[PDB]
Write an enzyme that holds these catalytic residues in place. Structure first.
Site, mmCIF file in Angstrom:
data_model
loop_
_atom_site.group_PDB
_atom_site.id
_atom_site.type_symbol
_atom_site.label_atom_id
_atom_site.label_comp_id
_atom_site.label_asym_id
_atom_site.label_seq_id
_atom_site.Cartn_x
_atom_site.Cartn_y
_atom_site.Cartn_z
ATOM 1 N N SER A 149 41.369 40.745 43.485
ATOM 2 C CA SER A 149 41.792 42.076 43.193
ATOM 3 C C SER A 149 41.745 43.317 43.663
ATOM 4 O O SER A 149 42.498 44.378 43.340
ATOM 5 C CB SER A 149 41.152 42.177 42.052
ATOM 6 N N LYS A 162 44.147 45.608 44.490
ATOM 7 C CA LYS A 162 44.681 46.553 43.356
ATOM 8 C C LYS A 162 44.714 48.107 43.939
ATOM 9 O O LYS A 162 45.677 49.024 43.648
ATOM 10 C CB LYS A 162 44.287 45.986 42.023
ATOM 11 N N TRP A 202 43.674 37.406 32.423
ATOM 12 C CA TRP A 202 42.543 38.729 32.650
ATOM 13 C C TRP A 202 44.374 40.035 32.889
ATOM 14 O O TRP A 202 43.756 40.907 34.277
ATOM 15 C CB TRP A 202 41.733 39.098 33.981
ATOM 16 N N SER A 246 41.384 46.199 36.691
ATOM 17 C CA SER A 246 42.278 44.263 37.159
ATOM 18 C C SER A 246 43.355 44.015 37.174
ATOM 19 O O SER A 246 43.002 42.946 36.642
ATOM 20 C CB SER A 246 40.729 43.953 38.000
ATOM 21 N N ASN A 267 45.753 42.927 36.043
ATOM 22 C CA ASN A 267 46.985 41.665 36.680
ATOM 23 C C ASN A 267 48.570 41.420 35.931
ATOM 24 O O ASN A 267 48.946 41.121 37.019
ATOM 25 C CB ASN A 267 46.331 40.196 36.581
ATOM 26 N N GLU A 288 47.868 33.659 41.625
ATOM 27 C CA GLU A 288 47.767 32.349 43.207
ATOM 28 C C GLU A 288 47.220 33.458 44.466
ATOM 29 O O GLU A 288 46.720 32.146 45.345
ATOM 30 C CB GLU A 288 49.944 31.982 43.477
ATOM 31 N N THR A 291 36.602 46.643 42.528
ATOM 32 C CA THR A 291 35.816 45.195 42.359
ATOM 33 C C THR A 291 37.368 43.694 43.673
ATOM 34 O O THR A 291 38.432 44.455 43.041
ATOM 35 C CB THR A 291 35.446 44.872 41.780
ATOM 36 N N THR A 351 37.379 39.902 42.778
ATOM 37 C CA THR A 351 36.355 38.739 42.229
ATOM 38 C C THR A 351 37.239 37.025 41.871
ATOM 39 O O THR A 351 38.597 37.133 41.626
ATOM 40 C CB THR A 351 35.857 38.463 40.842
#
EC number: 3.5.2.6
Length: 268
Positions: free
Chosen positions: A45, A48, A80, A105, A107, A143, A210, A212
């Site tokens: 992420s 972003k 998310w 974050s 999506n 993906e 961040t 992950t």
């Protein structure tokens, strides 16, 4: 002025069971701390943040871009998407989607903004335009999180991340109002309290983004930190590990950030 003081990053990554990549720059003196800094790590992420910067850059030429309302369907909501799911029935503005992508974050927001920029290649093109030749985004959420060992898709290096972050938050890559908006979004991040922020004293300003991935011990954080009384520090900490089931560690990211600040002689 690189690695004037050695720090035990090797012991840290060995205890973690993988690889840690760190690049930190003192923007006052130019001193740096560097460990595996030119290796590629998955962005997860963390792309972003740069996505929001690319939107801000476009907004310099497209007045009213940030206020444009975006409607989307249930099919846009991937796992998310904690903010965009609350506005499914109403839509959100480009600015709100950008803030959600940076600060939560989100999506669905990230994919909607990627579409606005012309996809992964359009974000990559923006990074090229500020002089970053390392960054590549190749895929969409979710993906892009595969984090396959040796796969260069959707990766950058800690050094290139830090260099680009500096240009966008402190240099001239964005016009001044957009620069401060990018800084403000990073400062408002909610997902990074256990990463670089955990190494940063409470009385210093900080913004971060961040990442992950969910496999291969792969997680990261990058930040701009303003210690009081001295020039800001820009840094990036990326991790990965050899096995798909290896877990990431926020504590390792915070520990690597502490070592970076110690290496730069920044009392924290």
């Amino acid at each position: 002025l690189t690695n004037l003081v050695a720090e035990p990053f090797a012991k840290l990554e060995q205890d973690f069971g993988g690889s840690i990549g760190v690049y930190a720059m003192d923007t006052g003196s130019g001193a740096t701390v560097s460990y595996r800094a030119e290796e590629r790590f998955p962005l997860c992420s963390s792309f972003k943040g740069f996505l929001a910067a690319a939107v801000l850059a476009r907004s310099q030429q497209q007045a009213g871009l940030l206020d444009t309302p975006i409607r989307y369907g249930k099919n846009a909501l991937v796992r998310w998407s904690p903010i965009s799911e609350k506005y499914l029935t109403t839509g959100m503005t480009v600015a709100e989607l950008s803030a959600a992508a940076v600060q939560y974050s989100d999506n669905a927001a990230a994919n909607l903004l990627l579409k606005e920029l012309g996809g992964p290649a359009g974000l990559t093109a923006f990074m090229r335009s500020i002089g970053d030749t390392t960054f590549r985004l190749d895929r969409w959420e979710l993906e892009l999180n595969s984090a396959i060992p040796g796969d260069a898709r959707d990766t950058s290096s800690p050094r290139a991340v830090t260099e680009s972050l500096q240009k966008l938050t402190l240099g001239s890559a964005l016009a001044a109002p957009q620069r401060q908006q990018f800084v403000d979004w990073l400062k408002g991040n909610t997902t990074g309290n256990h990463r670089i922020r955990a190494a940063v004293p409470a009385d210093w300003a900080v913004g971060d983004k961040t990442g992950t991935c969910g496999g291969y011990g792969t997680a990261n954080d990058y930040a701009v930190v303003w210690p009081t009384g001295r020039a800001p520090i820009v840094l990036a900490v990326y991790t990965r590990a050899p096995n798909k089931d290896d877990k990431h560690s926020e504590a390792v990211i915070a520990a690597a950030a502490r070592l970076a600040l110690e290496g730069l002689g920044v009392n924290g």
